[PDB]
Amino acid sequence: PRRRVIGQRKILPDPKFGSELLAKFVNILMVDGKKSTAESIVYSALETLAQRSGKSELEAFEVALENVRPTVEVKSRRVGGSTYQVPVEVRPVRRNALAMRWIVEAARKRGDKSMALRLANELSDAAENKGTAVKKREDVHRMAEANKAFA
Amino acid sequence: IKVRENEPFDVALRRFKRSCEKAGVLAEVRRREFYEKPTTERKRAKASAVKRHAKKLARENARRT
Amino acid sequence: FCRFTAEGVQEIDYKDIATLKNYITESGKIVPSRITGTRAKYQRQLARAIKRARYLSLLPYTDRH
Amino acid sequence: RKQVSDGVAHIHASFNNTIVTITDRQGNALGWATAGGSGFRGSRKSTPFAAQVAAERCADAVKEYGIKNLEVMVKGPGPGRESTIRALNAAGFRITNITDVTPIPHNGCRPPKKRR
RNA sequence: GCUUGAGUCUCGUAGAGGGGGGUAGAAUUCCAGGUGUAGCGGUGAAAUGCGUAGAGAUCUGGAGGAAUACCGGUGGCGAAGGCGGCCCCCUGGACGAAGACUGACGCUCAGGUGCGAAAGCGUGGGGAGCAAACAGGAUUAGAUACCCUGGUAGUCCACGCCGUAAACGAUGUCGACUUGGAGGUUGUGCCCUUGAGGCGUGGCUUCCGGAGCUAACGCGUUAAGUCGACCGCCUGGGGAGUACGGCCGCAAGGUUAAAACUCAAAUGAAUUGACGGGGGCCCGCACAAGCGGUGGAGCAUGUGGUUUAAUUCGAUGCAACGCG
């Protein structure tokens, strides 16, 4: 905030296998604190990703994570009377944060049958950068590419 | 104005430009003559410069630092 | 802080350009007396000498000729 | 294309735009590229990056001339005046010498009153 | 009569002091030509404007007007306004050394005379850039303003007119006295120039400050302190520095300068808060970074409005509106 540099709370990993990055992913999908129902979706979308790719649960998510993880974002740093954007590098603990956020919100739309079928396909198209999950990563670079003259 | 740094330069090192003006006179005659404000802004220039010098010889307080 | 003919007395000449090159920068501009430490009496005489050497093409007005 | 050996790279870095023109030793231009010609219209025209990309788009179309070494003529304050020459050194050229060619008057014509 | 007042000569010093005449460099603009290509320019952004008739950029050559970067410095000169590239001529003023000479020839000054920023006016030239007026494009609810693109008078020269400025250290001129310090500039004396010096004596000038003064701010040996000589100016504010009349001026206009009426105030300094699209520092889901909502729908409740015999009364910016 104004002065305090906080220390964030400790996060407990997924209770199927050791993965703290997956523990934050279910929190982004999380609605009204229903952890038990939310963990049932981040599982049932994960082995179904594995049968459609032949990989394991840990490595198949990371394949689709690198195509939705950005590297530069634009922030409004006011210099004076004019108003523009300033591209900066994304923090490593922040790189996955909006990467996992984009997968959930893209899986909020495009309803085939149910949620377990939504983000499983969203992880499938992001494994080969097809769906809208990577497009919301793509367009951020376009504002970053067109405004990279501000440094 | 002129700089060579004959063989081993690999960088500008062009401090000879800012050694005389490189901006000072060109951003002064590109506008605002007034025929007047060079007199006013220079009377107050040394007026504040001598008080920064007056307190340069009058800073002899303890100040507990 | 340096000294000049205020101590080693001689009259300012416009022909001995060897001494006049020490009081002009690489761009041909006149170095102020606040840097060389010369007195105001001979700085005014030096200014006429530089302007006279510039007229007789013994010292350049600038390096962009 | 004439296969020229050397040349001179004049840079006209004004307040609103940076014009980079690479000529020969006799002052005959061989090609040019400006910050406003390399996209970047509006506030992005007057920035050191647009001057930097102006030299990169001036690095080609000469290259046929085959210039190996060149001199840099810097004129005007510019938003850049350092990025446009850093990119010229990294474009594959040999920066021999740099001089300032700013048209500084000795109290000649009267400046305007504009921009109050 | 006399010499400390004033003045003259002798030898030197510094200075953008003034007038006249040439000359140098940079830069801007314009013209012609060469190379060279799609933008140039401008703004917070954009457009007017310029450009495929080839602009912008670069080079060469030429023509013009204005002003002199650096030196350059609360540095210097001049009564003031004001004056700065360099050189030739004429010339004014100031200061220092030690002598010589006149012998109060001094100070101020109504009227009068002369000089007198810039703008403007008359005649004849010149006109690069800048630029009132004016046009177009922008902003805005409107913008005949601030912004941008152009652009006339003028800014420049020769001779006159105008005599007006916040023409201001807002402090008239001359003369004497009264703690001091720190500097700048310009002479000069002595000692060792024995080594970028040391010790004094004059002119000008900057800052800080003792006594003293002042309503305070502040002035303070160049006093707004302590005394003398003379001139000018003021008698609450508005009206009004206006009209009338006189004088001057080609004109613009300047100078002299009221009254009726109207108000019990106007004003200056300083003090405490408040405010600032003032500055410096800091804080708060204030912003930022995210989550979930309202505003769309229905229903419940409250308020206003409408209606009614009554639809009791109160709350009704934040801090009232599922309130009493």
Curated annotation (Swiss-Prot), chain A:
The record's keywords, sorted A to Z, are:
Ribonucleoprotein, Ribosomal protein, RNA-binding, rRNA-binding, tRNA-binding
Quote additional remarks: The strain K12 sequence is shown.
Function text: One of the primary rRNA binding proteins, it binds directly to 16S rRNA where it nucleates assembly of the head domain of the 30S subunit. Is located at the subunit interface close to the decoding center, where it has been shown to contact mRNA. Has been shown to contact tRNA in both the P and E sites; it probably blocks exit of the E site tRNA. Protein S7 is also a translational repressor protein; it regulates the expression of the str operon members to different degrees by binding to its mRNA.
Gene name?
rpsG
Q: Family assignment?
A: Belongs to the universal ribosomal protein uS7 family.
Instruction: Name the domain of life this protein comes from.
Output: Bacteria
Keyword Cell inner membrane recorded: no
According to its UniProt entry, the protein's GO biological process terms are: cytoplasmic translation; negative regulation of translation; ribosomal small subunit assembly; translation
What species is this protein from? Escherichia coli (strain K12)
This chain belongs to the protein called: Small ribosomal subunit protein uS7
Q: Name one GO molecular function term.
A: rRNA binding
CC terms in the record's Gene Ontology section: cytoplasm; cytosol; cytosolic small ribosomal subunit; membrane; ribosome
What does the subunit section of this Swiss-Prot or TrEMBL entry state? Part of the 30S ribosomal subunit. Contacts proteins S9 and S11. Cross-links to IF3 and the P and E site tRNAs.
Reply yes or no: does the keyword RNA-binding apply: yes
Full-protein positions shown:
2 to 152 of 179
